Amino acid sequence: SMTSHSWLCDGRLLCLHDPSNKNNWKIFRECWKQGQPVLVSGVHKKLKSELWKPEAFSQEFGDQDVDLVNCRNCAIISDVKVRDFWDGFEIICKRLRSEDGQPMVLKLKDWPPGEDFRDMMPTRFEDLMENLPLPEYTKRDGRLNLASRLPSYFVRPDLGPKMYNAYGLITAEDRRVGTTNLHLDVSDAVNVMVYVGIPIGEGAHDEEVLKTIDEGDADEVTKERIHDHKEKPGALWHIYAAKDAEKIRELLRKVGEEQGQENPPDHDPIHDQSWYLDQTLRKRLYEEYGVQGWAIVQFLGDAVFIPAGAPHQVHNLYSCIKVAEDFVSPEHVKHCFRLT
Ligand SMILES: O=C(O)c1ccncc1
Ligand SMILES: [Cl-]
Ligand SMILES: [Cl-]
Ligand SMILES: [Cl-]
Ligand SMILES: [Cl-]
Numbered sequence: 323s324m325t326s327h328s329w330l331c332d333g334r335l336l337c338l339h340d341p342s343n344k345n346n347w348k349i350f351r352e353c354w355k356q357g358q359p360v361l362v363s364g365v366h367k368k369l370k371s372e373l374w375k376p377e378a379f380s381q382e383f384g385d386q387d388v389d390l391v392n393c394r395n396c397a398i399i400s401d402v403k404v405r406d407f408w409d410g411f412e413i414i415c416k417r418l419r420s421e422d423g424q425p426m427v428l429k430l431k432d433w434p435p436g437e438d439f440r441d442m443m444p445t446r447f448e449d450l451m452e453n454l455p456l457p458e459y460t461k462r463d464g465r466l467n468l469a470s471r472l473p474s475y476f477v478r479p480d481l482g483p484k485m486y487n488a489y490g491l492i493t494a495e496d497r498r499v500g501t502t503n504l505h506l507d508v509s510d511a512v513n514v515m516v517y518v519g520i521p522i523g524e525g526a527h528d529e530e531v532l533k534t535i536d537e538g539d540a541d542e543v544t545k546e547r548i549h550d551h552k553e554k555p556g557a558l559w560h561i562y563a564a565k566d567a568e569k570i571r572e573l574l575r576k577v578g579e580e581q582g583q584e585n586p587p588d589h590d591p592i593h594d595q596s597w598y599l600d601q602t603l604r605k606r607l608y609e610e611y612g613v614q615g616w617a618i619v620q621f622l623g624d625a626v627f628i629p630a631g632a633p634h635q636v637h638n639l640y641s642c643i644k645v646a647e648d649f650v651s652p653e654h655v656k657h658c659f660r661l662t
């Protein structure tokens with residue numbers, strides 16, 4: 323039967339089932355006030371699916387100049403055409419290659435650039451903004467979005483949305499690597515998976531995806547979404563409570579020292595955005611510091627709600643297109659205040 327919601331992460335994570343249910347807020351707000359992330363499924367079914375394909379982005383915008391990042395080693399690939407990224411999104415043998423002759427796992431950096439998303443893509447913008455879940459929190463003018471309502475004593479988010487476009491990580495070695503390293507944001511965000519590209523060429527990569535999710539510490543209810551409903555999984559997230567950030571900094575300072583980094587006792591390994599917590603570091607965080615995370619698999623059409631100040635990392639399993647809107651909820655407004 324259709325239900326309003328379910329739980330993932332053994333009851334620690336709310337999953338809302340209907341993105342346009344006008345009563346979602348009553349369930350949402352109790353979980354959110356406690357600083358938990360929230361998942362809303364089914365957003366893809368509300369969108370104009372033809373607007374969110376990699377072929378359309380290449381055809382319409384292929385001639386713009388951009389930089390990419392090699393996810394395996396962090397190297398910048400400078401001043402290439404945005405078609406060089408998109409045409410290899412799903413066809414492996416079209417990807418830029420590294421010195422070793424392997425097809426590279428790439429991230430498109432800052433595209434569309436800064437705040438130009440609405441000017442460059444006004445139909446996409448309309449399609450996203452009209453279908454975001456919890457609209458009183460997430461729309462630019464929502465009754466519970468304080469973004470446009472706060473003085474300069476608060477850090478206000480840039481006008482979005484932001485696009486996050488990147489290939490999936492492939493091999494056993496890539497299991498220890500991030501699409502996006504551990505970092506925190508001073509605003510709230512809703513991040514929506516609008517497209518998951520399962521490749522072809524080396525299209526027999528189904529089994530390393532299960533070992534990544536398994537070793538990623540994903541729950542049994544989450545593994546059932548693959549094997550029973552055949553939903554497409556895009557990315558593996560780890561998110562931590564805002565209250566645990568300083569314990570995460572102490573660990574990463576200790577591990578820096580152990581690896582002979584030379585860093586002042588004050589420097590911020592979260593703000594550096596230089597760490598991905600692999601199974602070894604996540605186990606050590608739990609055991610030595612008492613800190614437990616939420617391991618979240620974002621499928622096509624899942625919306626991930628990210629509490630302000632909450633450290634998070636993402637590991638794309640397959641090539642992903644996602645779009646995120648920043649907002650400022652009353653529940654978390656402390657995290658963007660500039661005093662005390
Ligand atoms: O690459 C992502 O998916 C991402 C980047 C930054 N914050 C959240 C998610
Ligand atoms: Cl558009
Ligand atoms: Cl709402
Ligand atoms: Cl990063
Ligand atoms: Cl908080």
Ligand SMILES: [Mn+2]
Pocket residue numbers: 505506507634
């Ligand atoms: Mn982020």
